[PDB]
Amino acid sequence: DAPQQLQVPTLAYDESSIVLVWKAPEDTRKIVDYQIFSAGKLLGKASDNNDNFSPAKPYIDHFYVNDKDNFQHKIVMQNFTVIGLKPETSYQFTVKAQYADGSLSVASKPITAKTSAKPQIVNVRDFGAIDDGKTLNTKAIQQAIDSCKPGCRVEIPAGTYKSGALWLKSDMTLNLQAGAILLGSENPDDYPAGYRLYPYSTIERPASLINAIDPNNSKPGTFRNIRITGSGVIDGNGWLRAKTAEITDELGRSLPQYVASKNSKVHEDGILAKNQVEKAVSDGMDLKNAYGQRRSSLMTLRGVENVYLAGFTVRNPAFHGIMNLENHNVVANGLIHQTYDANNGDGIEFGNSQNVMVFNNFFDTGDDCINFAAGTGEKAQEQEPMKGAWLFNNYFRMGHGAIVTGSHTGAWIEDILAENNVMYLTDIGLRAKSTSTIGGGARNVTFRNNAMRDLAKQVMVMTLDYADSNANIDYPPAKIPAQFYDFTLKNVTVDNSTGKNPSIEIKGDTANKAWHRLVHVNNVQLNNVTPTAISDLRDSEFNKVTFTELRGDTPWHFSEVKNVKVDGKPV
Ligand code: NI
Numbered sequence: 001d002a003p004q005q006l007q008v009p010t011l012a013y014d015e016s017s018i019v020l021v022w023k024a025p026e027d028t029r030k031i032v033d034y035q036i037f038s039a040g041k042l043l044g045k046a047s048d049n050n051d052n053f054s055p056a057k058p059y060i061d062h063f064y065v066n067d068k069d070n071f072q073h074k075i076v077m078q079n080f081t082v083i084g085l086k087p088e089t090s091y092q093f094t095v096k097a098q099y100a101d102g103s104l105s106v107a108s109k110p111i112t113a114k115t116s117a118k119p120q121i122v123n124v125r126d127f128g129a130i131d132d133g134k135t136l137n138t139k140a141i142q143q144a145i146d147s148c149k150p151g152c153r154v155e156i157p158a159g160t161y162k163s164g165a166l167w168l169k170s171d172m173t174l175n176l177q178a179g180a181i182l183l184g185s186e187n188p189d190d191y192p193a194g195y196r197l198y199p200y201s202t203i204e205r206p207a208s209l210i211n212a213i214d215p216n217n218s219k220p221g222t223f224r225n226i227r228i229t230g231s232g233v234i235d236g237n238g239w240l241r242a243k244t245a246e247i248t249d250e251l252g253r254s255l256p257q258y259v260a261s262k263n264s265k266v267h268e269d270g271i272l273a274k275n276q277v278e279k280a281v282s283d284g285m286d287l288k289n290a291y292g293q294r295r296s297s298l299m300t301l302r303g304v305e306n307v308y309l310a311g312f313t314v315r316n317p318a319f320h321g322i323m324n325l326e327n328h329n330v331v332a333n334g335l336i337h338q339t340y341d342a343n344n345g346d347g348i349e350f351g352n353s354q355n356v357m358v359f360n361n362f363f364d365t366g367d368d369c370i371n372f373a374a375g376t377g378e379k380a381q382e383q384e385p386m387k388g389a390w391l392f393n394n395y396f397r398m399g400h401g402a403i404v405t406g407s408h409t410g411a412w413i414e415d416i417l418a419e420n421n422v423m424y425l426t427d428i429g430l431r432a433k434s435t436s437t438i439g440g441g442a443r444n445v446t447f448r449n450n451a452m453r454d455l456a457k458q459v460m461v462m463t464l465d466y467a468d469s470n471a472n473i474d475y476p477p478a479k480i481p482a483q484f485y486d487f488t489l490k491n492v493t494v495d496n497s498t499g500k501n502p503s504i505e506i507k508g509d510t511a512n513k514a515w516h517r518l519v520h521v522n523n524v525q526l527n528n529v530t531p532t533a534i535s536d537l538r539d540s541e542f543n544k545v546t547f548t549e550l551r552g553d554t555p556w557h558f559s560e561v562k563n564v565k566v567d568g569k570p571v
């Protein structure tokens, strides 16, 4: 059957290049690659193209190096980058599946796609931006952005440019060139009032280092067509290095290591984080809220329709890494996150956003790699559901969970597909969490065709707490309680999970009517992991789940279950 849904991701094109992605089927056992054709002429194979353009790809190939016996699910590439094109030119494209036996599928339905016109180019050095070792460049960089006409590319060339909060606008690209480091100011005054997370949030957070934030309005379409690209680094200047400041990773490359702090330690551990918490406490906040709310995140983009993030390295946030709040049509392509172990330094947060795509990312994060959020309590639905996410061809290294939905489930997290990824040293593959009074939940979540090694904690955890007016809770409680259902875990392999907690852990509170339902687990092999602990679950089935080298006596531990089934036989 022909590959489906060949497409250019939102804004993933410029004057000389176009990125293509397509769906891979559920069952890829026979598919070993994809070949891409332009006007029926072979441009190449997806595997080879990713070797060239994806920062995840060498890590992903390397993951299989010691996999004699073919234990690990072999992921396929679902993207191809076309370069060397001409400005304002249409190109037609098809894709074919390449099979084990060497034959090819029928072509996909073609697409035509057109490169853009060569953009006005604005260099920040022409506004007096300077890498001189302590000029603050905020004004220079903001002047360059302000001078932008629609379609402008703003360039930060090689060099380290210290900067305070910057404010982006519609219809522009900020390009961070090779050798460019955008460095956060450590001065809290360089980050003025930014935003409140939700409309009903009461504490104002500072601006991030990079912002698309309208002072009054969060609605999707407040901004449009924002692109941040290039192979340079955005460094938030949040934290000191850890005692072991740098490590050599599994490819022999160096990773930075950021101190893992807490609210009572930030005065010794923080840089911007320290200074911002100090300023907030002296302004009157207790230390807990100052730590929790008053550190600048690296990037906050709110109300943007069409966002393309590509190529850049993220380091050292004072708080979160990349935040998307109420955006539509977001693509993150080939970002490199090196933020281990900055406290709350998650890779990408998606908050009440729709139609989001992450591919070719490398994640080494201080918190969750990819987190989904949708508000809290009765007011949550003041906002869009968190709906439509497609996460593929990424390499997850360290982090609190590769795919996390969310704790904040109020308006619903839904229609999430994470396929053809590799995880190595990550805490957890799939994490789903909520409490009763948050409301909403998550549904239609598929985690499939992923391979995992040396997980630090557990494979998959779905947890639902009660309570009640037992609550020290800031939002109004939800009338309909939080639930999870319609979760699919298929064609997944894990070798080693070094935590002492349950490999597959599903937990609720059936007494208080809190259960999960409609969990479908098919064709999963778990080697050298602990037994499962599955609670509060109904109308679910586990088929062709094989445990080998079990760290315990029996894999299956069930309690408080209704209409569930292994494979194929009632529990
Ligand atoms: Ni090859």
Ligand code: NI
Pocket (backbone or CB within 6 Å): 235, 256, 316
């Ligand atoms: Ni640094």
Ligand code: NI
Pocket (backbone or CB within 6 Å): 341, 342, 365, 366, 367, 399, 400
């Ligand atoms: Ni961490």
Ligand code: NI
Pocket (backbone or CB within 6 Å): 367, 400
């Ligand atoms: Ni956490």
